């Protein structure tokens, strides 16, 4: 079962340096674990702005998670998560950049709490969205609302904690889930 998966990862300064390193390590671990041909990966850093660090076609040409993320420059600015999700939905899931028409679209949004910006993510509604939290401010009442909004429904199945989520033996079968 094919899956095109985008890591949308938070490069803003609210994260502690070690927390951002854990995000990098998490993405690389998942790509290393879920390495079979059915999976393709892209990664987009967001802060004030959004940068595709690598697309699906880069992933296929290299398939070396360490080399693909080698040159990521830490943005360390604000947290425009809404604009970021919209960016992925419209600018990353493209046949142009190596997306597969038959593949299930999955987004792993890795972040530490609420966004600087607001709006809607209607354009991403056909995408299966997981929210992977890190940090001491990730689940408060300040952010509860935003995280529910970003996650696929039921949110209780899609809002995760990086620390516990990364240990799942059946992680690759979990991200392939399509009935929910």
């Amino acid at each position: 079962g094919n899956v095109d998966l985008v890591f949308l990862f938070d490069g803003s300064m609210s994260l502690q340096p070690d927390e951002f390193q854990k995000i990098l390590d998490f993405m690389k671990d998942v790509m290393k674990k879920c390495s079979n041909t059915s999976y393709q990966f892209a990664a987009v850093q967001f802060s004030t702005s959004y940068k595709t660090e690598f697309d699906f076609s880069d992933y296929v040409k290299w398939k070396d998670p360490d080399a693909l993320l080698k040159h990521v420059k830490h943005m360390l600015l604000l947290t425009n998560t809404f604009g970021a999700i919209n960016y992925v939905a419209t600018e990353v899931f493209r046949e142009e950049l190596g997306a597969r028409p038959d593949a299930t679209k999955v987004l792993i949004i890795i972040t530490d709490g609420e966004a600087t910006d607001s709006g809607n993510i209607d354009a991403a509604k056909d995408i299966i969205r997981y929210i992977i939290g890190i940090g001491k401010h990730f689940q408060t009442k300040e952010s509860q609302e935003t995280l529910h909004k970003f996650a696929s429904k039921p949110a209780s199945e899609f809002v995760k904690i990086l620390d516990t989520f990364e240990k799942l033996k059946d992680l690759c079968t979990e991200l392939q889930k399509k009935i929910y």
Epitope: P17, L76, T79, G113, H137, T140, K141
Partner: antibody, heavy 120, light 106 residues
Framework: EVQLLESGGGLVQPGGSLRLSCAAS???????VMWWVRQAPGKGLEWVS?????????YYADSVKGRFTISRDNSKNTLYLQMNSLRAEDTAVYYC?????????????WGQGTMVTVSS | IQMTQSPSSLSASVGDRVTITCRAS??????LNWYQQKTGKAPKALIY???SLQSGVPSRFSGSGSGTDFTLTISSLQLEDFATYYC????????FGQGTKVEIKR
Amino acid sequence: EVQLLESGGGLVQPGGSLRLSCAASGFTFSRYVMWWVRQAPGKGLEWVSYIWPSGGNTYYADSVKGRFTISRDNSKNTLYLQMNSLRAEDTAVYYCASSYDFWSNAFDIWGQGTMVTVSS
Amino acid sequence: IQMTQSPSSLSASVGDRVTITCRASQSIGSYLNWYQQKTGKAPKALIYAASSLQSGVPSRFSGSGSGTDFTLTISSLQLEDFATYYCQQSYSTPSFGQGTKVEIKR
């Protein structure tokens, strides 16, 4: 525009107490870690305290621990500093400031400052 | 984390290019910020994240560096730029460099 306005500064005898206030306007105060940062005359900037958005968790520089208390009223968008047992070394300009990106360790907005003088 | 700023003070003519350095006691990646403080005024952010100029700040200001060594540049010093400049690491809880006092040479 966004601003922070301090008030409450003045002359206090050593051992006395004083309360500073900082009114926020133009931004969503309740989302931000808030700080007090002070500057003694002709010296550098020293953070003395900060408080999480909800106002539960509080933190203090060792120079002020046990003597100062930070608090906030998100309903009035106001930040407070209760200074007790004041020493000569606490004489400084006191600024409030917000965390850049809600809770980074960079400073976003600064108040105008309020002078505190501790002298008998 | 100790931030060593350099020099402590400098004198330069209007239109001159000005360079201020800041060294950290450990690698702090890009968690390095610059503030300007004029007399009897609060600090004001010029640069976040080593190189990111903040809106409103004149484009003559620029920041560079990562790891341990950082630089604030004023491409053409103006009368307005008379002030004290501080670097500030945001890697852990804030610490500041000692400051650099810029005077106008005439």
